[PDB]
C-alpha cells in the first residue's frame, strides 16, 4: 500500500479548511494573538458562509492560473529510507484486510442478541465506544454485523454508538513486506498582501494539529516535524510581488506489499523406519 502523502494532504485540507473558515468563533481563537486590524480584515474577507472571497488549494506547475489573492500550494519534496526490519517483514495476517473505518450504528433487537450493522464486512473489530464486553456477553462478529447477547443489557435496545472496524476482502492469509520511509513535503501560502499570508500560515498550523487526531494520521502518518522558512517574495516580475512563507512537513510511513501464502499444511502422517 504505497502512500501518496500529497493526496492525503489535499483530502484532509479541503474539507477541514472550509469548515474552519465557515465559523467565526474558531477563527478568533486561532487569530487570538494577531492585532485587531489584520484579524478582522481577514475575517471580513474569507470568514463566514457568506464570504465572497474564497481560498483555493492546488499542486505545483498547473497550466491554468491560481487565485493569487489567497492560495495553498503543495509540492512533493524529498524522501528517504530510515529503518528496516529482518527479511523486510512488517506483519503477518490471516485475513486480507483493507482500510480501517469508523462507523456509527444503532443497536437492533434480535431474540437472543442486540446487533449493530455496518456498511461492509467487519473483519477485525477494534473497539465499540465505551463498551467492555464481558465473556457472558459473548461478543462475536458475523458478516457485516457485530452481536452481543441481550440479557442484563435490556435497557440498550436503542443504544447509539460509534464502531471502529476494518475492511475484510479475502480469507487468503499472507505476509507483509516493506520498510519505513521518512518523507518531506512542502506547503506554502501565497498572496500579494503579506498580512494575509501570515494569517493564512497560522490557520494552516491549527489544522495540522487537528490532523494529529485523525485516523489516517494516527495509524499511517506519524511523527510530525514542522519547519518554517522566511517570508520571501516569490515573484518580482509583475505589477506587485507575491509573498509566501514556505513550510516543510515530515512524515514516517510504511511502503508495504502483500505476499500471499498457499502452502497450508492440513495433513500430518508419521511413519516409522523399516529397520
Amino acid at each position: 500500500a504505497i502512500t501518496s502523502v500529497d493526496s492525503y494532504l489535499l483530502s484532509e485540507i479541503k474539507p477541514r479548511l472550509n469548515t474552519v473558515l465557515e465559523n467565526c468563533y474558531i477563527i478568533d481563537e486561532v487569530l487570538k494573538d494577531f492585532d485587531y486590524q489584520t484579524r478582522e480584515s481577514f475575517k471580513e474577507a474569507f470568514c463566514g458562509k457568506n464570504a465572497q472571497h474564497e481560498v483555493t488549494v492546488g499542486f505545483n506547475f498547473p497550466k491554468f492560473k491560481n487565485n493569487y489573492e489567497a492560495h495553498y500550494l503543495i509540492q512533493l519534496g524529498q524522501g528517504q529510507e530510515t529503518k528496516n526490519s529482518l527479511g523486510s517483514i512488517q506483519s503477518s495476517y490471516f485475513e486480507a484486510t483493507g482500510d480501517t473505518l469508523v462507523e456509527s450504528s444503532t443497536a437492533i433487537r434480535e431474540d437472543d442478541k442486540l446487533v449493530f450493522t455496518v456498511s461492509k464486512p467487519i473483519g477485525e473489530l477494534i473497539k465499540v465506544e465505551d463498551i467492555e464486553f464481558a465473556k457472558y456477553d459473548n461478543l462475536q462478529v458475523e458478516g457485516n454485523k457485530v452481536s452481543f447477547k441481550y440479557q442484563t443489557n435490556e435497557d440498550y435496545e436503542n443504544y447509539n454508538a460509534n464502531i471502529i472496524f476494518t475492511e475484510k476482502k479475502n480469507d487468503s492469509k499472507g505476509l507483509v513486506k516493506g520498510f519505513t520511509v521518512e518523507e518531506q513535503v512542502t506547503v506554502v501560502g501565497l498572496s500579494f498582501n503579506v498580512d494575509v499570508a501570515r494569517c493564512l500560515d497560522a490557520v494552516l498550523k491549527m489544522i495540522l494539529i487537528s490532523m494529529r487526531d485523525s485516523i489516517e494520521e494516527q495509524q499511517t502518518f506519524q511523527l510530525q516535524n514542522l519547519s518554517f522558512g522566511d517570508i520571501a517574495p516569490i515573484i518580482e516580475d509583475g505589477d506587485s510581488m507575491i509573498f509566501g512563507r514556505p513550510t516543510i512537513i515530515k512524515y514516517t510511513s510504511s511502503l508495504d506489499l502483500d505476499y500471499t501464502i498457499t502452502q497450508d499444511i492440513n495433513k500430518l502422517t508419521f511413519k516409522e523406519r523399516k529397520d
Partner: peptide
C-alpha cells in the same frame, strides 16, 4: 506593465448627456 496578478475594474467615468452622432439644424 500589464495588470494580471491584481486586477481592478474599469474606472467609473462621469457620463455626459450629449447624444453621440447627433444631427443639428
Amino acid at each position: 506593465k500589464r495588470e494580471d496578478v491584481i486586477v481592478l475594474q474599469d474606472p467609473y467615468k462621469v457620463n455626459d448627456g450629449i447624444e453621440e452622432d447627433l444631427e443639428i439644424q
